[PDB]
Design a protein around this ligand. Structure first.
Ligand SMILES: O=C1COc2ccc(C(=O)N3CCC(c4c[nH]c5ccc(Cl)cc45)CC3)cc2N1
Length: 295
């Protein structure tokens, strides 16, 4: 008699049967999270995390949105957090977009007729832009927290050179240095939390993955005249990871009739984990923006 193989486990050895999950088109398990209100939801909202991090970092944002009677949902992108895949490897950046769309489609089956929003930070914001550009008119709105539109010009220059070197010869292990955690936030407690989280990949950026981030930037640029979705864009003026010039470019080039930019003067990259005055404002502004578009 043949026997069923041992239960499939996360990279942290937890059986997927014990966790909310979804199997993507490549047969990879994605770890999922849900925050549903007690009443009928007014809308759905997908939360899209950034490079090297995971969905558990959105707990407070998600609880605030759930408090507005939205059903919030997320997954860890392939190669991140509790989802499968070699760490911070992706065959093509579109895999992330495809997988968001599968999860959105699956949720809309369970909750039909509801509007759906996207919320993305950093690389997750590039994923949100490309997801909304692929399906014009499908999403009710998008919240972008320091989305990856333009990288830091120096990091882009250094990676375009490494991409050229790696694309010319066979160097599968070539990597750049790790992200300088001090530039994430002026809030030192949040920098220390980032450095203490075992689900965050703090290894050097692999050149293969950097090439996919360069692809995301190029694809976002081409997508902007196709972007019509309403959006709120939040950006720190002293962001060394996603250049503020990209936020101004998005405001100028997107076709969206409903587009708003808020600049946080002196703030670093992770606006939802910045100094309290900034973080409280970010949560309040997202609350107001979504409340106005779900009422
Ligand atoms: O809360 C947190 C924790 O720490 C993060 C690290 C990276 C990011 C993120 O998604 N990034 C996008 C990629 C960017 C980057 C670093 N080197 C590059 C070379 C080329 C290109 Cl196109 C982009 C890059 C860093 C920020 C989010 C966060 N947010």
């Amino acid at each position: 008699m043949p026997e069923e193989s041992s239960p499939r486990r996360t990279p942290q050895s937890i059986p997927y049967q014990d966790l909310p999950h979804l199997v993507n088109a490549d047969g990879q398990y994605l770890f999922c999270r849900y925050w549903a209100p007690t009443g009928t939801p007014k809308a759905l909202i997908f939360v899209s995390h950034g490079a090297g991090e995971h969905s558990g970092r959105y707990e407070e944002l998600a609880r605030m949105l759930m408090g507005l009677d939205l059903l919030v949902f997320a997954h860890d992108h392939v190669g991140h957090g509790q989802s499968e895949g070699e760490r911070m490897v992706v065959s093509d950046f579109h895999v992330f977009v495809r997988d968001v769309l599968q999860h959105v489609d699956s949720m809309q089956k369970d909750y039909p007729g509801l509007p759906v929003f996207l919320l993305g930070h950093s690389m997750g914001g590039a994923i949100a832009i490309l997801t909304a550009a692929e399906r014009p008119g499908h999403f009710a709105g998008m919240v972008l927290i320091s989305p990856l539109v333009l990288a830091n010009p120096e990091s882009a220059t250094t990676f375009k050179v490494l991409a050229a070197k790696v694309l010319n010869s066979v160097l599968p292990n070539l990597s750049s240095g790790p992200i300088d955690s001090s530039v994430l936030s002026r809030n030192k407690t949040e920098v220390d939390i980032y450095n203490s989280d075992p689900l965050i990949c703090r290894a050097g950026l692999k050149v293969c993955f950097g090439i996919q981030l360069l692809n995301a930037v190029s694809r976002v640029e081409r997508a902007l005249p196709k972007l019509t979705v309403p959006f709120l864009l939040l950006q720190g003026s002293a962001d060394r990871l996603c250049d503020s010039k990209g936020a101004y470019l998005l405001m100028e080039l997107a076709k969206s009739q409903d587009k708003t930019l808020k600049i946080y003067e002196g703030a670093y990259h992770v606006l939802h984990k910045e100094l309290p005055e900034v973080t409280n404002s970010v949560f309040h502004e997202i609350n107001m923006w979504v409340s106005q578009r779900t009422a």
